[PDB]
Design a protein around this ligand. Structure first.
Ligand code: OLC
Ligand code: OLC
Ligand code: OLC
Ligand code: RET
Ligand code: OLA
Ligand code: OLA
Ligand code: OLA
Ligand code: OLA
Ligand code: CL
Length: 265
């Protein structure tokens, strides 16, 4: 599976290699450092929304372990020989990223429907169609990327199929947001709109990284892609989580929860 990603095609200078290694290790520290934040502040969240901050904790660890795994797999696969890091063992690949998205994405969406105050049959209903839409996006995306070295034409076709799911998914998100924000408290009806525009931006970086092999097939594209994933990672999971948390705390205070009213105070 590693021989199917362009990373196995190029030698990397010490700067390109150590720069990629530093992006992955940094992502580990950022996520686990955020994990502590999401853990501590959970007490200041009412029981209604407390599950939202717990989902962020699960997202931080899920992303941290894979990023840490990517880093080690990045140092075990290459060795500095004759002035450049050259492949050695087939272990590094971007497929592990996609397997992670299968888990983190359902968590990122579910904590969005919690702060929106959805409940009952609608919560279980809107959650199933979104996840099935998300999984369809990730699976078809995992198939196309297997061809990013052999058949770029297939990468396009699968990227197109994956985009159909992505558009439908966002449409359901945007539809529920703008039809349920009036219920939110403490003025969070305004914050939830920015979160959606924060989603449309950070999430769109992934299909761009997915297309790096097409318009930049070289060692600098491997670097740009990992840089794009990093920027998108800390925006779809960290910054995104911080906003979800802020919303969960604000509505908690507006609902009469003392630990939340004393925290903001
Ligand atoms: C043969 C090739 C496969 C072709 C067929 C698979 C690909 C379908 C792709 C996009 C449409 C998916 C959307 C289908 C679901 C529409 C209903 C819906 O999503 O609404 C849920 C509701 O809004 C929740 O509250
Ligand atoms: C292969 C390429 C195919 C790409 C095709 C491009 C079409 C993109 C159009 C819209 C994006 C939809 C994003 C969802 C925006 C939410 C807006 C919404 O839901 O409507 C507001 C609501 O009705 C008020 O209550
Ligand atoms: C460093 C944290 C910067 C991000 C701060 C995000 C604010 C979230 C919040 O509601 O504040 C929690 C407060 O720190 C609990 O005492
Ligand atoms: C870590 C968090 C998230 C939300 C990862 C999300 C990934 C995507 C939104 C990926 C989308 C893709 C599409 C729309 C089509 C090309 C292939 C991708 C899977 C990269
Ligand atoms: C506070 C948060 C503490 C976070 C502690 C972890 C910090 C960095 C990640 C360490 C994982 C090992 C990275 C080195 C492996 C490598 O060189 O690829
Ligand atoms: C199959 C995919 C559908 C998954 C269904 C997700 C259902 C909810 C899991 C998280 C529990 C959230 C309940 C919060 C408490 C409450 O409802 O008041
Ligand atoms: C538990 C993971 C499966 C989730 C199924 C729900 C998602 C539905 C979306 C499309 C799934 C398509 C599965 C078949 C694709 C075959 C491609 C392949 O793996 O070779
Ligand atoms: C979950 C309900 C069933 C829908 C499952 C979705 C199946 C995948 C969607 C369409 C795939 C079309 C692209 C296939 C390209 C194959 C090219 C080739 O093999 O030569
Ligand atoms: Cl990722």
């Amino acid at each position: 599976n590693s021989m199917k990603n362009i990373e196995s095609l190029f030698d990397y200078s010490a700067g390109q290699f150590e720069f990629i290694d530093h992006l992955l290790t940094m992502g580990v520290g950022v996520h686990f450092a955020a994990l502590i934040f999401f853990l501590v502040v959970s007490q200041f969240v009412a029981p209604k929304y407390r599950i939202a901050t717990a989902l962020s904790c699960i997202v931080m660890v899920s992303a941290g372990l894979i990023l840490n795994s990517q880093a080690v797999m990045w140092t075990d696969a290459y060795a500095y020989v004759d002035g450049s890091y050259q492949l050695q063992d087939l272990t590094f690949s971007n497929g592990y990223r996609y397997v992670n998205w299968m888990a983190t994405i359902p968590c990122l969406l579910l904590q969005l429907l919690i702060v929106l105050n959805l409940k009952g049959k609608e919560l279980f209903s809107t959650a199933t169609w979104l996840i099935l839409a998300a999984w369809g996006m990730i699976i078809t995306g995992y198939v196309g990327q297997l061809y990013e070295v052999d058949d770029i034409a297939q990468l396009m076709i699968w990227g197109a199929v994956s985009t159909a799911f992505f558009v439908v998914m966002n449409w359901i998100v945007g539809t529920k947001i703008f039809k349920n924000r009036a219920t939110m408290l403490g003025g969070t009806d305004s914050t939830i709109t920015k979160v959606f525009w924060l989603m449309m931006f950070a999430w769109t970086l992934y299909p761009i990284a997915y297309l790096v092999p097409a318009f930049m097939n070289n060692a600098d594209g491997v670097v740009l892609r990992q840089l794009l994933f990093t920027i998108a990672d800390i925006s779809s999971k960290v910054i995104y989580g911080l906003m979800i948390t802020y919303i969960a705390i604000q509505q908690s205070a507006a609902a009469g929860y003392v630990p939340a009213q004393q925290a903001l105070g």
